[PDB]
Structure formats: C-alpha cells, structure tokens
Structure 1
Amino acid sequence: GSGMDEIVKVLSQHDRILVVGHIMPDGDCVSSVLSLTLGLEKLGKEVKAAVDYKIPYVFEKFPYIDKIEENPNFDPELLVVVNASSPDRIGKFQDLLDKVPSVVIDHHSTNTNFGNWNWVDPSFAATAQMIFRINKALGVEYDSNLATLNYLGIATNTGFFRHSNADVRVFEDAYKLVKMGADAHFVAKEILENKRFEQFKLFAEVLERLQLLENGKIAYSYIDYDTYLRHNCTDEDSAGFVGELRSIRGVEVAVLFMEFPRGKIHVSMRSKDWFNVNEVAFELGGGGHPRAAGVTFEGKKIEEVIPRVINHLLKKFKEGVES
C-alpha cells in the first residue's frame, strides 16, 4: 500500500477537500475528522467535514464540533475518508467514491483499501495518531484547540491509556499533544462523565442476564431491542458495557450481544490477558483486534446468534488453554 509520504503529497496537491468519517462516530472518528479538517484549513485549503450520522451528545462541547456536517453541499476535488474500514461505513458519502478521487487513512487492519490512495497502518492505536503525523508533515502549527481535538482519539481508542494498544508511541503522542495545549481533563470529563441515569438502569439489565462459563473465565450477557426501548436507550448508551464485564475478577473473555435496531445483533468481544477474540470474530464474519473484536448479524433472532457465537468461542477457548 501507499505510505504516509504519498498521502501527504496527494493532500498537498488538492485544495477543495471533503473529509468524511464513519457512521456511529466514536472519539477516534471525531478526532480524526476534525484534526485533519482543521490542519488542512490551516494550509489555506477549502475543506468541509462530514459524517452521515447524528453526532453523539458527548461531543457537543468540543471546539469546532459544528464543522462536522450531515449535509455538507460541497463538490470536492478530493474525498478523504478517515478511520472508516469499508465504504458501507460512510453512509451516503460512499456514492462519491465513484465520482471523486479518494484517499483512505486508517489504522484498522480490516480496511478494504477502497481509496485510490490508501495509507493503512495497524501499528497505530488510533487513526488520530496518523492524522497527527500527516499534519506535522504538511507544516501545520498546533494551537490548544487542535491539540485537544487530536488528543481525543488517542485517549478514547486506548480506553484512556488502559488497553493493550497503549504503547510507547501512544504515550509520546499524548505527551506532545498535552505539551502543545491539549486539555486532557476536558476530554475525560466530556467523554466519560456525561452518563445518563438510564444507562445505569440499562446496565442493571445486563447484570441480571449475565452468565459465566468455563470456571468463570467467560462472561456474556445481552440486551434485546425491547430492553433498549424500555429504558429510552440506543446502542450509544451501552458503549463501555462490555469492558465493564471484562473487569470482573477472573474473567478472560467478555461478550455482549446487542439487538439494535430490531433484528440487528451486534456482538462485542473483549479479552484480558491472552485470548485472541479477533480469530473468533473473523470466523463468524466480523473482525477486529486480538483483545477487542466484533461481529454483526442481520435478520436473526438473538436466540440463534447467542448459542452460535458462544459455541465458537468455547471451541477456541478450550484450544487456547491446552495450546
């Protein structure tokens, strides 16, 4: 694939750019979209940012969040798709892939290389780290707001420096961004301290349905669509729940089945010390990382998905213990 140098040249050559992130945006999406958009604007370019999805509440106080548009009305000369592993993930903007030359910048090993130019590097924990390097290579000077926005995705994708992907390069980037004015406490407060009361009630439903297997080493639970409705919640509200199940003493693998909307079952998997959940996800048609991976089924009963996923998980887990 192309490297950073080729993507920097392409970005330099084009002056009307649409930067696009993926649906159901998370911290790395907002971070990467806004950090690249602002970097390119500082070079004088005419740039718009777009996500075909409602921006979640926790991002509403971030600087420049209103630059992300659902309906940009912009005819770009270049499409730049960040942190999105496949064209279906960018919603209605995938139609532009047929009309406009495109750049892909992504850390997901699952990326389908759907751009005319692709820089995909899974050694990074966050696409925001790739945007940081692109901006510095282009000559962008950071201010505090841009540093805060670029810090955001590095923090969220590492669980705020807790996960296995928080390596030396993550800590060096975070130090450089805080030195340049990133407001680390602002980011933690807005992302992690805006919990709805209903999210506590929703998690109580998860605890009620929690089941342990394999001498307590596997824990799984589920939320069906009627339960989301009962609590005025969506799958936005159950973010972080599967990590709470991983946090139980003695659990090595945590799995959460989430039905939202009706008939769409998302499977979120996390592992603690050694089990490669990405191998299970891939074999079920999904994908991810060794310690965090997922699968999405459409048109299924939760009663069919759960036993299939658990069966495959148990088979591979029992292999790993003997090895």
Structure 2
Amino acid sequence: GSGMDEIVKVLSQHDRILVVGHIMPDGDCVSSVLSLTLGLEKLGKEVKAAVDYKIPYVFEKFPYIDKIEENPNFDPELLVVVNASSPDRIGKFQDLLDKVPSVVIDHHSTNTNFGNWNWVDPSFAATAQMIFRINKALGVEYDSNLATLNYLGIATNTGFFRHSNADVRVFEDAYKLVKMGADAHFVAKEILENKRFEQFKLFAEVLERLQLLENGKIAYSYIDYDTYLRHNCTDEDSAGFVGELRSIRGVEVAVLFMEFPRGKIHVSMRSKDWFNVNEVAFELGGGGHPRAAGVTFEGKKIEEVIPRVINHLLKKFKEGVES
C-alpha cells in the first residue's frame, strides 16, 4: 500500500491527468475532484475533471463546478480516481483502468485498491483532507476559491462538524482552510439551505411509516419508488433523512430503506453512541463506518429486504446490549 509520498511522486511525474469522481457525487466527491484538479493545474499540468453523473443542484453555484465534465474529450497519461471505493462507482470511466495507469486516493476502508497506485487512509474523515495534504506537498498556493472547495468535503462528510469523525485533525484542517479564505457560510448555505418543499412532504411520508423497536432504541422507515415519483423526488431529495431519524430522542440506530430506481433498494444505517452498524452492513454485503454504513440490493422487493435487514440488526443489537 502506497502512502502520500508515492502518490505525490506519481502525480509529479505525469502532466496530462484526468481526475475522476464517483456517480451520485456528494460533497466529498465534488470537493476532492475540484480541489485536486485545480491544485494540479497550478503546477501547470493539463488536467480535466470528470464525473459520469448529473451534478446535484446544491453544487451549481460553487466556483469552477463547470470544470466537472460528464463527457470529457481527453487522452490522459494518468487517471486519478478520488473518493470512489470501487471501479463500478466511476461509471463509464472504468474503461480507462485497462488502458491508462491509475492512482486511487480515498478515505473509504472499503476501497478495493483498483489503481496501479493506491493511497487509502480511513483515519481521514474525508478524501478532501488527503487532497489538501497532497496539494500542500506539491507546493500549491491556496486562494479563497480553492480553500472553499477543499473545505466543502470536510464539512459535508462530518455533517458540518457534528459526527464522531470530526476529530482534532478535521478541526485543524477547517481552521487552516478558513484562515486561507474558505467561505464556510457560503458552503453551509448552498448545501443545507436549498431544501425543496417536496422534501418536507417526502419526509412526512417517512414519518408516517416510521416504526420503533427495542424500547425506542431502533427506528426505521422506508420510501418506495412510487412514493419518490408521487413527490417529484429522487434519492437526492432524501439525503439527510436517516440522520433526522437518528436525531430522535432515545434512538440508537436508525435505518432508512430507499427504493430508487425501481427494485434497487438502498439501506442507509446510522448509529448514535455505540452500536457498530458497519458490522451489520458488511454481513449483508455492504459496508461503511461504525456509525454510518449502508447496503444496496438489486432485484429485490422492499417487502423482502426490510424484514431481513431488521432481523439481522435486531440479532446484532441484542448481542451488543449483552456486551
């Protein structure tokens, strides 16, 4: 397993670079892609950024968001894949893995190490923190826009400094980026204050279906595909719903089952204090973090997935309570 130094050397050695993020991009993906792309351009390299997916609405006002292309026309010397744990997550760009030397930079412990060089460090809360250190190691000078873009992923992946991954290194990075001009309020406003009215109606559906188990310590609900369509919503609109269920008093584990598209059931799990949802996720074929993890089923009825997941969660939860 390569460290940062070997990645920095490899980046220094190539001058035509395609930086690729994952489908369904989140703040850390957008942050890592644009921060590395702009950093490498400041070294004079020829760099393009690509994500095989529509950029979500909340990113449309960020500086340089138009640098991320869905259909780049580029012949790179080097592929750099950021924040994507497996080749399927980069969509049509996985075809380049067979033709172009590749670097992987990722904080996900689930990363399959599919690059020729791989720097994977789960002690970071965000891949953006790794890009920050790469850019500094390369000699990149930050301006306010680059600082804002690199702050983005650290904020989003820690829930804006609320989750258990917000450790001293996260706060140090945020401080350094704000000192360099990162507009923390701009980032919060664009990410968190662009709610659709339909999102309130969709969450009302979640609350109607909400079920508590184990003396209120487990909360789960679901959104079926017809309900997304009924409210002109996609799974972009239910971002943050599972954390709202975790925020209920006395809840330790929250699970949200989301069918989107039809027959594709994503299970999002969150815990509050002590329960390791990643162990449940892993055993079901997914993965993630001790306090935030997920599983994705293809080709299943939601009526089959829900009781199987709840069954496994109850067994594990009862074991944990017994210590």
Instruction: Name the residue aligned to 2:41.
Output: 41
Quote how far apart the aligned CAs of 1:151 are.
0.1
Q: Displacement, 1:165?
A: 0.1
What CA distance in whole angstroms lies between the structure 1 residues aligned with 2:120 and 2:221? 33
Q: Structure 1: how far apart are the matches of 2:212 and 2:318?
A: 15
CA distance in 1, matches of 2:266, 2:66: 29
Task: After superposition, give the CA deviation of every residue in 1:7-65 in whole Å (9 maximum; x if it has no partner).
Answer: 00000000000000000000000000000000000000000000000000000000000
SS of the residue 1:61 aligns to:
coil
Give a deviation string over 1:193-223, Cα, whole Å, max 9, x none.
Answer: 0000000000000000000000000000000
Instruction: Tell me how far 1:71 sits from its aligned partner.
Output: 0.4
CA deviations over 1:86-115 (Å, ceiling 9, x no partner): 000000000000000000000000000000
Q: What per-residue deviation string (whole Å, max 9, x for no partner) do you get for residues 143-192 of structure 1?
A: 00000000000000000000000000000000000000000000000000
Question: 1:259: Cα distance to partner?
Answer: 0.2
Distance 2:105 2:322 in 1: 39
Q: Deviation per CA, 1:105-148, whole angstroms, max 9, x where unpaired?
A: 00000000000000000000000000000000000000000000
Specify the SS of the correspondent of 1:152.
helix
- How do 1:244-283 and structure 2 match up within 5 A? 244-283=244-283
Q: TM-score, normalised by structure 2?
A: 1.00
**Structure 1 SS opposite 2:275:** coil
Query: What's the offset of the Cα at 1:319?
Result: 0.3
Aligned equivalents of 1:120, 1:300: Cα separation in 2? 32
Q: Alignment identity in percent?
A: 100
Name the CA distance, whole Å, in 2 between partners of 1:154 and 1:50: 20
Count of residue pairs brought into register by the alignment: 323
Q: Which residue of 1 aligns with 2:20?
A: 20
CA distance in 2, matches of 1:3, 1:255: 35
SS in structure 1 of the partner of residue 294 of structure 2: strand
Partner of 1:301: 301
1:17 and 1:297 map into 2 onto residues whose CA distance is: 34
* Cα displacement string for residues 259-288 of structure 1 (whole angstroms, at most 9, x for unaligned residues): 000000000000000000000000000000
d(CA) in 2 for partners of 1:162, 1:65? 26
Q: Which runs of 5+ in 2 are unaligned?
A: none
Q: What is the rounded CA distance, in whole Å, between the counterparts of 2:239 and 2:58 in structure 1?
A: 12
CA distance in 1, matches of 2:321, 2:116: 43
Cα distance, 1:242 vs. partner?
A: 0.1
CA distance in 1, matches of 2:286, 2:47: 33
3-state SS of 2:135 partner: helix
Q: CA deviation at 1:289?
A: 0.1
> What secondary structure sits across from 1:186 in the alignment?
helix
| CA distance, structure 2, for counterparts of residue 109 and residue 299 of structure 1 | 26
Q: Which runs of 5+ in 1 are unaligned?
A: none
Provide the residue aligned with 1:120 in structure 2. 120
Name the Cα RMSD after superposition. Answer: 0.2
Q: Secondary structure at the match of 2:189?
A: helix
Cα deviation per residue 1:65-87 (whole Å; 9 max; x = unaligned)?
00000001100000000000000
Moved over 3 A (4+): none
